[PDB]
Structure 1
Amino acid sequence: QTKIQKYAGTAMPYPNRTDSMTPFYINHLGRHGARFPTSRKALDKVEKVLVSAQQENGLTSEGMALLSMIRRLSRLFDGQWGKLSKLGETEQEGIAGRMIRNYPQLFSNSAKIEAIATYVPRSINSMDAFLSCMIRHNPALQVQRSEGKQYNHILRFFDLNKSYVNYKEKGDWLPIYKAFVHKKISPVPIMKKFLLNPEQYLDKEAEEFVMALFSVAAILPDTSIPLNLEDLFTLDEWHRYWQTQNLRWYMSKSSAPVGKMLPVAIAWPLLSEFIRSAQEVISGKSDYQANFRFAHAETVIPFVSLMGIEKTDVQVCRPDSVSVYWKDYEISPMAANVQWLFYRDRDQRIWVKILLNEEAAALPISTACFPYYSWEKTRIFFNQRIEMAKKTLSVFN
């Protein structure tokens, strides 16, 4: 059942974590917590097909039960599209809580923290769940909270680059994805459960229906509604669905050769801003003990690849091998977050530890005390990544 959760991909709920020197600064990026579906399109597709089968009774008994379940979900999702769920709130409370319990000295006395978020309500509400926990876990904190479109350049860079928008909507990854779905997804086994004469459905409408049904089931664990649809598909069918969505994310938002690093390079302003906020705290220009940022999977995924956390920027030429080497649920589950923890040793040398979803991450540079890296070396490495990103983007107006 761990495998079935992983097969939700970027809709996987944030994984279980447990508590357990002290840093002088934390630099953070977090996706919003577990959320409702953002679009009714999949639900509507599933309902339209089942209702039509109800005309000229083409439903099995379970198709009748599924149709009723779909109508109920449509009423429960009404007015809630894209909202942070109670689960997403508690995910943020857990990330903040473990941070505070791990490093009380960092957030002690009158420590100062700043948080930013996008204009998207689920990310703003995620920041507030996180900050509320902090303030409860030390009301003497000083807190700056802001949000909105002025952070688009560093938190929503994927909307601002014209070449990338064009690639995401129209690029060469699309035919590869569509061929891959046709190869991996067999719709008739699934729809026989629900519809008489499934073989009379054109492959395209059948694939669309099944893909839409997977989307409904995949998001339900994120809603805090006590209903589950995992058993509509076999475990091997969930495996195949996840492979298709994993490849979709990899090619459209990460380091796939077909994207030519364009989906990754667009993140360089956030990496540059991360370095700048840390350099200012190290120098004394800023006296923040933490900078927090709340945004989206499309913020986290290319940011992580651009940092070069090992494996997350792999460039796999064969589409069918991607799932072996690059796992979206390991990078951007719900509430996915990156934390840079800064330390000053007895000699005042600065060390940095990188946490990806609260587990130590590797960079392709040396260190004699993993998971701690020399900040100087890491900064040089990240600045080199930023320069390569600007070079990449120079080929796209």
Structure 2
Amino acid sequence: GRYYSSKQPYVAPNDATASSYSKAPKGYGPIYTESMARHGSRGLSSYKYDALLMRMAETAARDGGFKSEAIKAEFVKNLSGITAANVENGYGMLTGQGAQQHYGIGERAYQRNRSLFDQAAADGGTIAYQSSGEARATESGENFEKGFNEASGGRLIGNVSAPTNPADSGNGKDFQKNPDTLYFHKVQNPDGTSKVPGTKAYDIANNYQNFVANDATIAGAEKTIGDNVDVKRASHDLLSQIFTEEFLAKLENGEYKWYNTTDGTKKGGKNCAPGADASKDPDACGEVSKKIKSEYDAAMDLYNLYIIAADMHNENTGDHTFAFDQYFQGAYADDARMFAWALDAEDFYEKGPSYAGQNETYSIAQPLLDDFLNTIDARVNGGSTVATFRFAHAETMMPFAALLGLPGSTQQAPASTTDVYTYGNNEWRGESVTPMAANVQWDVYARKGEDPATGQRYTPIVRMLYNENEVPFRSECTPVADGSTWYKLTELKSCLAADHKTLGQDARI
């Protein structure tokens, strides 16, 4: 493991963690739970990083550009192996690991709220499954659903809310498409529909896309980061394990250049991964304009294979093994850290807290935060939906984390194109903010009856898990008592809003 950026595989809680979540205060019992999770680990999106590096390898073999015969053979074996794994799985598809991530999250979701769901099975409580409508998010949800149902012995299968707009009529029939809360970052919805002009959802997505496309600070900071000399040095360092100085020198002065075509040249034809059927897996045929024209390009492509390889752990087996981690050992691990920063920086600036003086990058998550609260109200107010399980994307989680002020997402970069986001000046990391299957879950409990002092019902209370670790809400929020991670619903409605005001003494039970 190491420096996987937002390709970090989900770290499931150990038995100690899962058995030690805090108990709600005396008199409070479960009434609702909800979640939003990023899809699980996926393979390569297309025949691209693996394609281009194989074209480079073929040229190195022809021109004597590998450091040794053993090194040549090992590099080609690694590339062939990851390509073969993707051809078999289908490019872009959920990996075995990605399925297991969601299966486990689903199992433990039932287990943590066994009392809630056993009551629901008896009382007619219903479960709502939602996705953005994107196939990998829905398929992640399907695995969560399988795990949840196995853990509960099928006793909640008859308790699923029928969607009014299902993801599909087959395996995804239980999933309601909700791209306003799970794909708020784009006008174009995954199902081929688009948000309607004049609606809040449209403006949120459109204003955001226009903002990031044209913002001078983001553009300048990204140029500064793209020109980073130490990343260029790390690129050379990484590649010199494999290729000769003479070969890499020709790359650095433009004598070598590879395109994603049949022969690696611009005049080559459209290519397809070996063994793939273009009609069944269109993503096995890459875009020809994709290219390697510098050491930076080749090294970042190699780094991308290293991080996806971790996500493809289950496919790293038998007749299609690969060992990209061997290029990132010892001093070379520090190169991985540089490449991780380069990737994290782009996400940070475009989708995360980004630079000080704006909130355009993450205010877009407001519809999801609104729904997190609104679905609690629906239940508290007499509704039958006891859980809402949502499945979405890194583009959903990153701004959601920043808007909530979750750990890791509390620091904006300076308002500067030169004094930029770095690992030394910012806590944000893809690996911890938005790993594969990243998720936020809230549990809601209530004390029954009317408070004799108010003649009204007791305020419900809420507790959060982030990647299945129990965490406090943001520091402005006051919990129900000293030493508690439970918070009044009234308090969250105040303290999670943009003013972040606490109700103070009125937050205490």
Task: Give the TM-score normalised by structure 1.
Answer: 0.88
Change (3 A) 1:247 1:27: same
Query: What does residue 338 of structure 1 align with?
Result: 440
Give 1:267's match in structure 2, choosing from 360, 365, 379.
Answer: 365
Instruction: Show the counterpart of 1:36.
Output: 43
Corresponding position: 1:366 with 2:366: no
Match of 1:118 among 128, 132, 142: 132
3-state SS of 1:157 partner? coil
Q: 2:465 aligns with which of 355, 365, 388?
A: 355
- How many Å apart are 1:281 and its aligned residue? 0.6
Counterpart residue identity of residue 201, structure 1: L
For these two proteins, the number of residue pairs brought into alignment is: 382
Residues 16 and 273 (structure 1 numbering): CA distance in 2 closer, same or farther, change over 3 Å? closer
Q: Could you tell me which amino acid in structure 1 is paired with residue 413 of structure 2?
A: V
Q: 2:109 is matched with which residue: 99, 123, 126?
A: 99
2:490 is aligned to: 376
Residues in 1 aligned to 2:425 and 2:52: alpha-carbon distance in whole angstroms: 28
Q: 1:208 to 1:156 in 2, by over 3 A?
A: same
Tell me which residue corresponds to 1:191: 239
1:68 is aligned to 2:182:
no
Q: Could you tell me how far apart the structure 1 residues matched to 2:61 and 2:107 are?
A: 50
Shift of 1:329: 1.5
Separation in structure 1 between the aligned mates of residue 213 and residue 44 of structure 2, nearest angstrom: 20
Shifted more, 106-115 versus 323-332: the winner is: 323-332
1:25–1:289 Cα contact (<8 Å) kept: yes
SS at match of 1:267: helix
Q: CA deviation at 1:106?
A: 0.9
- Residues 36-55 of structure 1: pairs in structure 2 closer than 5 A: 36-55=43-62
The residue number in structure 1 matching 2:306 is 217
User: What residue number does 1:156 align with?
Assistant: 183
Shift of the 302–322 alpha-carbon distance from structure 1 to 2, 3 Å rule, reads farther
Equivalent residue in structure 2 for 1:320, among 416, 422, 426: 422
Check 1:45–1:169 CA distance in 2 against 1; reply closer, same or farther (3 A cut).
Answer: farther
Task: Give the corresponding residue for 2:380.
Answer: 282
Instruction: Name the SS of the counterpart of 2:484 in structure 1.
Output: coil
Q: Percent identity?
A: 21
Indicate the residue corresponding to 1:308 in structure 2.
405
Change (3 A) 1:104 1:150: closer
Deviates more, 1:109-118 or 1:327-336: 109-118
1:306 and 1:112 mapped to 2: Cα distance? 29
- Unpaired stretches in structure 2, ≥5 consecutive residues: 24-28, 168-175, 188-204, 254-292, 317-321, 415-419, 452-457, 501-509
Residues 57 and 42 of structure 1: CA distance in aligned 2, closer, same or farther (over 3 Å): same
How big is each residue's C-alpha offset from its partner over 1:225-265, in whole Å with a ceiling of 9 and x where there is no partner? Answer: 22331121222112212222222211111111178221201
* 1:258-315 deviations in Å (ceiling 9; x for gaps): 782212011111111221111111111x211110101111111111211222441321
8 Å CA contact 1:184, 1:244 repeated in 2: no
Counterpart Cα distance in 2 of 1:91 and 1:100: 15
- 1:66–1:168 Cα change, 3 Å: farther
Counterpart CA distance in 2 for 1:145 and 1:122 is 20
Q: Secondary structure at the residue paired with 2:94?
A: coil
Rounded to whole Å, the distance in 2 between the matches of 1:25 and 1:358 is 17
- The 1:132/1:283 distance shift into structure 2, 3 A limit, reads same
CA contact (8 A) 2:107 2:149 kept: no
Distance 1:139 1:320 in 2: 48
Instruction: Give the root-mean-square deviation of aligned CA atoms.
Output: 2.5
Distance in 1, matches of 2:336 and 2:483, equals 40
Q: Which amino acid aligns with 1:295?
A: A
1:84 maps to 94
Cα separation, 2, equivalents of 1:145 and 1:14: 30
Q: In 2, are the aligned partners of 1:92 and 1:126 still within 8 Å (CA)?
A: yes
Q: Which residue of 1 aligns with 2:260?
A: none
Distance 1:381 1:273 in 2: 16
8 Å CA contact 1:116, 1:145 repeated in 2: no
**Which amino acid is the alignment partner of residue 152 of structure 1?**
P
TM-superposed CA distance for 1:205, in Å, is: 0.9
Q: 1:159-170 maps to which residues of 2 (within 5 A)?
A: 159-160=186-187, 161-169=205-213
- Is 1:173 aligned to 2:218, yes or no? yes
Distance 1:187 1:384, change over 3 A: closer
Choose 106-115 or 297-306, whichever is displaced more.
106-115
* Superposition deviation, residue 321 in structure 1: 4.9
Q: Which residue of 1 aligns with 2:190?
A: none
The letter for the 1-side match of 2:83 is S
Amino acid at match of 2:498: Q
CA 1:170–1:53: 2 relative to 1, 3 Å: farther
Q: Which has the higher helix share?
A: 1
Q: Quote the Cα distance in structure 1 between the aligned partners of 2:64 and 2:230.
A: 29
Q: Retained in 1: the 8 A contact 2:408–2:433?
A: no
User: Where do residues 232-251 of structure 1 align in structure 2 (5 Å cutoff)?
Assistant: 232-233=327-328, 234-251=332-349
Matched, 1:57 2:64: yes
Q: Is the 8 A contact 2:6 2:430 kept in 1?
A: yes
Q: Which segment is superposed worse, 256-265 or 128-137?
A: 256-265
Give the corresponding residue for 1:200. 250
Q: Which runs of 5 or more structure 1 residues have no equivalent in the other structure?
A: 387-397
Give the Cα–Cα distance (whole angstroms) in 1 for the partners of residues 423 and 214 of structure 2: 23
Asked if 1:140 corresponds to 2:250, the answer is: no
1:63–1:194 contact (8 Å) kept in structure 2: yes
Q: Tell me: CA distance 1:52–1:258, structure 2 relative to 1, closer, same or farther (3 Å).
A: farther
For the 8 Å contact 1:254–1:313, the answer to whether it is kept is no
Residue 114 of structure 2 aligns to a residue in which SS?
Answer: coil
- How far does the alpha carbon of each residue in 1:149-200 deviate from its partner, in whole angstroms, 9 at most, with x for none? 9522211111122343245456442442343243332222221222222233
What is the alpha-carbon distance in structure 1 between the residues aligned to residue 66 and residue 211 of structure 2?
40
1:395: which partner in 2? none
Q: TM-score, normalization: structure 2? A: 0.70
Q: CA deviation at 1:344?
A: 1.3
Q: Is the deviation greater in 102-111 or in 309-318?
A: 309-318
Paired residues of 1:58 and 1:195 also in contact (CA < 8 A)? yes
